[PDB]
Structure formats: C-alpha cells, structure tokens
Symmetry: C3
Subunit: 121 residues, 3 copies
C-alpha cells in the first residue's frame, strides 16, 4: 500500500591546470579532435590556500601560484569526453592539479565569415 | 531573465584598437581586455626553417569582454565582426554567455544600471 | 539549478591583497587571478602633456574569479564591494555567471563538493 503524498547545446569548458601539463593536455585534446581553444596565464589557489615556504626556521604562505587557464567552447555532447581528457592528462596525484568549470554559451560567431551557432565552433 | 549578457570575443592583436575604438564610437564603452594565446579549427600555422617545418599551435590573440544589456548584443556582434575581420583564417570568434547580476563596486548599484 | 555560480570581479591592483585577505578570512579561498586592462563607463582617463590632453582608454586592473556555492554569492559581493571601494570612479565591477558543473582534476569529484 502507498500513502498519498503532496537550448543552444553549446558550452564553455574552462579548466585551470598546471603550467607543466599544458602541452600534454593540449596534445591529447588535439589528437581527439577538440582543437578550438584559448589559453591564458593566471595565478590561483584552491581550497588549501596555497603552499608554505620555509626560510631561517620560519614558515611563509605563498597564496597565489602560477597556473594555466584553457577555454574550449564546444558542442554540448562533447563536454564529458573533454572533461575526461583534461582530468586524465592534467592529473599528477598532487593537490593543485586543477579544476574544470562548465559554463553555458548561448551563441558563437566566427568573425571571418559571420557563421553562427554550432557550425562556428 | 536578467537581460544582461557577456560578449567574450577573441580577435587579432593588431585589431584591438580598431575594434575597441569602433565600439566606443557606438557607445559600448565598458570592457575588459586580456592577452591570450589560441588556435581555431586549423590548429595553428606551419613555419619553415632550414628545410624543416614546425606547427605553431598557439598564437597571440586578444580577448575582449563586454558585459552588456541583452538588446545590444547583436549590434555589438556586428561591430566586432565588421572591424575584426580581414578575410583570413584566424580573424576571431565571439561567444555570448549569460550574466545574472552586475554590481558597480563604488556605489553598489546593481543590474542594468550598473552596465 | 546547479546552485553554483562564478563571481567574476574587476578591481584595482592596489586593492587585491585587501580583497583576497577578506575573502580568505570568510572562508572563500578557491580563486583564480588574472592581470587585465579595462575601462568603465567613463572611457578611461585624461593625461596632460605640455598643456595638451591625451586620453588613456585602458588601465591596469585585476580580475578575480571565484566559483562558489550559490548561497555564498551575496556575501561575496558584499565582501568584494566593501574591500575594493575607495570612493573613486574605477573601483570595479562584479559579474555573476552561471556554472553548470565543477570537476576537481586530481580526484574527479564533481559538483558542489568540488568547489
Ligand atoms: N572554486 C574555485 N574558483 C576559482 N578558481 C579555482 C577554484 N578552485 C580552484 N581554482 C583554480 O584552480 C587551481 C587549482 O586548484 P586545486 O587543484 O588546488 O583545487 P583544490 O580544490 O584545492 O583540489 P586539490 O585538493 O586537488 O588541490 C587554483 O590554483 C585556482 O586557480
Ligand atoms: N571553439 C573555440 N573555443 C575557444 N576558443 C576558440 C574557439 N575557436 C576559436 N577560438 C579562439 O579564437 C581565436 C581565433 O580563432 P579562428 O579565427 O582561427 O577561428 P576558426 O574557427 O578556426 O575560423 P577561421 O576559419 O576563420 O580561422 C583562436 O586562436 C582561439 O583563441
Ligand atoms: N560593462 C563592463 N563590461 C566589462 N568590463 C567592465 C564593464 N564595466 C567595467 N568593466 C571593467 O571594470 C573596470 C572598472 O570599472 P569602473 O569601476 O570604472 O566601472 P564604472 O561603471 O565606470 O563605475 P564608476 O562610475 O565607479 O567608475 C573597468 O576598467 C573594466 O575592466
Ligand atoms: O597549487 C598547488 O600546486 C598547491 C596548492 C593547492 O593545492 C591549493 O592552494 O589549493
Ligand atoms: O590564428 C591565425 O592567425 C591562423 C591560425 C588559425 O586560423 C587557426 O589555428 O584556426
Ligand atoms: O579606472 C579608473 O581608475 C578611472 C577610469 C574609469 O572609471 C573608467 O574608465 O570608467
Ligand atoms: Cl565566463
Ligand atoms: Mg588545492
Ligand atoms: Mg582558424
Ligand atoms: Mg568608471
């Protein structure tokens, strides 16, 4: 017995990774056919708030570290494969390896031709 | 809906002033500019040296971001495309991303009046 | 909804350390910082040389991005505004952008627990 009770299909993959994993990540994405990408130099910290460096028996926090931002605007159906590639290639087994954010994209336009939408990705 | 959007455009470094000035002339002034590298669908360019070839797969580009009233987006797309284009692969790409809220730091004004 | 958002704020370079420390003290630590240039609605500043005026239409700024749990957005807006403001045009702007998914690279943990 039971008691009665009361799209664009486009996305932006924004990932922060270590500088020394950029070429590995880029090459795996390229090999898989996910080519269009924008890369930025950034600084960051994750939930641990940076690292501690020692000098003359004293600890000093370094609360921003060099990182690389990659952005790929993609067809929605490609997001999970790209997440997988980024994670597999960026990981090293150490805190600081990176984070991926998925952000909606409502429109894409290629400048040269004014093509719009998924065909412009 | 918020009726605000973010226009994120990647253009050639030599078209930054042209595009910025054209936007300004049309009254679309608030903007954030970043130096980036990138490649589009062709995966870069091929450079020749000493009988060899090398693919340069990230090239200098400029990112402009304008957070704008939604009803201005198409006009801004048109200005960016007209002024960034050169007829050559690599001219750029424009992305439109939703923005839910905007706050001006100095006065704490929020929404479309803070654009 | 995902109940996750991106706080993207542009602030003065000389207010970064103050803002970052206040965010840290409130427990909002994960953050990405970029060097950018920008102008707001006034279109830059005027610099004088030999009694002539010249427009400087992009100035150095700092971008901070925090991807956060939605329930923290208003407090973070408050912190950024209170710490970044100086009473002068140019103090900054905050944008809130939806985030549909977050993944921690090292472990592949996803969602709000990965923030
Ligand atoms: N919530 C967040 N918002 C914005 N940027 C972030 C966030 N979390 C991480 N980042 C960026 O990603 C980079 C790498 O983060 P990191 O790998 O340290 O994340 P984490 O959550 O601390 O995981 P881990 O325990 O593996 O270190 C940071 O230096 C920062 O640039
Ligand atoms: N899908 C994408 N995601 C992220 N960034 C992109 C994407 N496509 C292009 N970009 C960025 O825009 C810049 C210019 O792209 P580009 O003009 O080469 O695009 P394209 O699709 O290859 O078109 P074209 O055939 O005109 O060259 C790239 O170098 C990169 O920074
Ligand atoms: N609509 C916008 N889109 C993108 N970036 C913006 C926008 N408005 C401001 N910015 C960025 O924020 C920075 C600071 O803007 P600013 O504080 O001058 O805003 P404002 O609207 O002109 O307010 P104020 O009257 O207090 O000066 C700019 O230099 C630019 O990097
Ligand atoms: O970024 C690193 O390499 C270590 C620091 C870290 O994991 C963090 O600040 O969250
Ligand atoms: O960016 C360029 O100038 C040429 C290369 C290009 O169009 C691309 O990589 O897609
Ligand atoms: O950014 C500054 O410090 C002053 C200029 C300004 O407020 C603007 O261009 O909107
Ligand atoms: Cl974004
Ligand atoms: Mg960490
Ligand atoms: Mg191209
Ligand atoms: Mg201003």
């Amino acid at each position: 017995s039971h008691h009665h009770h009361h799209g664009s299909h486009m996305k932006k993959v924004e990932a922060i990774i270590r500088p020394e994993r950029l070429d590995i990540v880029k090459n795996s994405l390229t090999d898989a056919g996910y080519v269009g990408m924008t890369v930025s130099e950034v600084k960051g910290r994750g939930i641990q708030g940076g690292i501690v460096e020692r000098y003359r028996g004293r600890e000093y926090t370094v609360d921003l570290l060099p990182k690389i931002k990659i952005e790929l605007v993609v067809k929605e159906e490609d997001v999970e494969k790209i997440i997988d590639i980024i994670c597999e290639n960026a990981k090293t087994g150490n805190q600081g390896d990176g984070k991926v954010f998925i952000i909606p994209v409502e429109e894409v336009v290629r400048v040269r031709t004014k093509e719009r939408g998924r065909g412009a990705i």
